[PDB]
């Protein structure tokens, strides 16, 4: 099965044909591209909020208008799919979702309300497709620039009213009947060390410091429960690099933030009226990024390693975090670099895949955002920016959705790519929760 | 080859399960999707501004977000292609273009600046898909709601500097060099009646009343100088319906209407504030539509009808115009009806393409537009408007882009959709200039 060696244009842009991006018919790859035998590994990349837009707007900084992502564009099986979100109380449509029930559709299969973790619109509990892959021996791993407590990697692995319940304090006021100490099953954290992944990697470290207000572990911080566990505890590239192997016995559970791990290219704000009356930016790498902390394709890379081990297979969850709270902060450079660094990890995901030969890999995003490439004379309301293009032309970025805090999210429909066995269930126009079905098909779980 | 008969949500949205759009594998239907064999015939459906956002907007409000665009929606083939224009000084990439710019791309294989038509950045023309396929001997339709001189149509038959240069009097000012008394092909107008398609329906009828002021015919009208040259006028429905065939001995050329044809649906234009301070708007018939006024999908069977008595094949182009401009003057109504008109076309297109079995149909638009689908609770800086769907639900749709008069274009790539003969060269990231290159080879033109 091949992978889309290079889709960049092939040519002088100026020039008749120069922009192409095939170099010849298509057929007979897309033929070699369908395989419906079982998959024995599942890699899912998501882009939070990298829509249509955001990958365009990467793309064109980054490598140019007529440049090619040799990981997010390379897979070979496209589509569309929509993410809307479910009203609790009508249980109509709400056109615009937000994390937890994005989240939840593709690791459950039920649609839900904003807001919600692994519960449908009645709170009641679904298992998701890590809890499942897990159920039948797969080895699983849950990786993520958030802290793991945020809505993508806490899908896989809790199940509670509200996102906002990340630990013990936060519970006992938000999810009162999720609360530990009032017989429920805990608060994200608490049920993230209870679904015990073998391979867990993102920030969120704060959170840990917490206590269990009840439970065996009752008083310890649930850093001290974590170990008291048997849970492997890294806190930087080195240490994670020095792990040999990650399995039920001993798990890792890699924090290295405090909150979200650092983005990778700092710039300033979008601002009104940015693109006229301010200079044209260009992007800068983030000196607090470190050698100590491993990027997002360094964490994948060594999860590959790890769940590789594992003869019956894997189901890994890898999430470019960053992006979408850049693209709330209307930071262009922010979540530019987030996608770059995304880009990262799907070429090592896609490496890996066509080697083995049975691992299906699918980059989507949770939803689509509110950032637009709009002319460079633009006079637009709300906030702006101008950026130096690897092109060496200005790019002008939008963000005119809110007035307020952030920038909103879009409904629009998204792009769905995939390589390797099962992969055509992603072509054309389907759901998140399809998204749920096709993984779980894939791996043969019953 | 099968077309996708229904991708709507299969259940209960509120229950597992319910939101799926597909239900089995698809594996099978896609390779059964796939073939090499030459194209006899290819129908071009764009939808002019018409981007993921645009095509889920309308779903949501039309058929409701686990609805299912019978047309839009029904192509199994899908991918996501680029739409940069040049900047004609430096030649480098102008990230958001304009109806002539991407209209040049796709009917000529190369990219230009934006308000160019049929020529490069050095002004020098090239051959369209149209003139192409009539010098091989092929049916050539040309269809349109929008001004037959408009951006979209034109640049299938006409080279000028300047989208503009609609007839003789706008020529003489804006493209000096094409104008015919000063020794160049005339006008948009004067070349249309050149290129002689066997097939030409759309509005602009206003802009045949001027007169060539030289060749074989100055001094007439354009009309006359139509009907001079053996062009049959249609000017509504019946008369159209009465067409028994369309030739180059008896071309067809109908025009419906002085300007644009009319939209298929009123409401008011959006507002600040229009979500939070006015009431949930339900979109309108316009009853300005007319049993005299052909729709798109009746001018697109006729077309067909026509076309297909050629046994050599045929090329037709087929364009929703108002998706856009209403897009443009922030009227969620009048863009969303124009998507649902739009469909239509589409329907009869797929219909046709089914029975023939040797029929490319594509379906996609020139460029990203600026609506967006936001949260019902949305305080933004633009034009906002809450609209009833027909999941009995409100939708908020947003337009924040720019102050002035029009919203702006955006550059987010965007969905490009086929079924037929080459209709792989779609999926995948592509350019829009590769369009060219795939309906030349599926069609054999050489
Ligand atoms: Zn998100
Ligand atoms: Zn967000
Ligand atoms: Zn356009
Ligand atoms: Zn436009």
Same mark, same amino acid.
């Given at each position: ?38 998959? #024995? ?50 249980? #109509? ?91 429920? #099953? ?261």
């Amino acid at each position: 099965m091949p992978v889309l060696e290079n889709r960049a244009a092939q040519g002088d842009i100026t020039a008749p044909g120069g922009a192409r991006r095939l170099t010849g018919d298509q057929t007979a790859a897309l033929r070699d591209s369908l395989s419906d035998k079982p998959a #024995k590994n599942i890699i899912l990349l998501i882009g939070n909020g990298m829509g249509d837009s955001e990958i365009t707007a990467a793309r064109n900084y980054a490598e140019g208008a007529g440049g090619f992502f040799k990981g997010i564009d390379a897979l070979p099986l496209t589509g569309q799919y929509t993410h809307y979100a479910l009203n609790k109380k009508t249980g #109509k449509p709400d056109y615009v979702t937000d994390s937890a029930a994005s989240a939840t559709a593709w690791s459950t299969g039920v649609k839900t309300y904003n807001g919600a973790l692994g519960v449908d619109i009645h709170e009641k509990d679904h298992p998701t497709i890590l809890e499942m892959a897990k159920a039948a021996g797969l080895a699983t791993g849950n990786v993520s620039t958030a802290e793991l407590q945020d809505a993508t990697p806490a899908a896989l692995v809790a199940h509670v009213t509200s996102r906002k319940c990340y630990g013990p304090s936060a519970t006992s006021e938000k999810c009162p009947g999720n609360a530990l100490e009032k017989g429920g #099953k805990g608060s994200i954290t608490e049920q993230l060390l209870n679904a015990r992944a073998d391979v867990t990697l993102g920030g969120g470290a704060k959170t840990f410091a917490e206590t269990a207000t009840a439970g065996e572990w009752q008083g310890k911080t649930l850093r001290e429960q974590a170990q008291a566990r048997g849970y492997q505890l890294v806190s930087d590239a080195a240490s994670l690099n020095s792990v040999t192997e990650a399995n039920q016995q001993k798990p890792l559970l890699g924090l290295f933030a405090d909150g979200n791990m650092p983005v990778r290219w700092l710039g300033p704000k979008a601002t009104y009226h940015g693109n006229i009356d301010k200079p044209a930016v260009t992007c800068t790498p983030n000196p607090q990024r470190n050698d100590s902390v491993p990027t997002l394709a360094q964490m994948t890379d060594k999860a590959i390693e790890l769940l590789s081990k594992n003869e019956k297979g894997f189901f890994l969850q890898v999430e470019g975090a960053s992006i979408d709270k850049q693209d709330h902060a209307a930071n262009p450079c922010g979540q530019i670099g987030e996608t770059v660094d995304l880009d990262e990890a799907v070429q090592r995901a896609l490496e890996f895949a066509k080697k083995e030969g049975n691992t299906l890999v699918i980059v989507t995003a949770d939803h689509a955002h509110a950032s637009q490439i709009v002319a460079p004379d633009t006079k637009a309301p709300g906030l702006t920016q101008a950026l130096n293009t690897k092109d060496g032309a200005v790019m002008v970025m939008s963000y005119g959705n809110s007035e307020e805090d952030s920038q909103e999210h879009t409904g629009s429909q998204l792009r769905i790519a995939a390589y390797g066995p099962h992969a055509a269930n992603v072509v054309g126009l389907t759901d998140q929760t399809d998204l749920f079905y096709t993984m779980k098909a894939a791996l043969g779980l019953k």
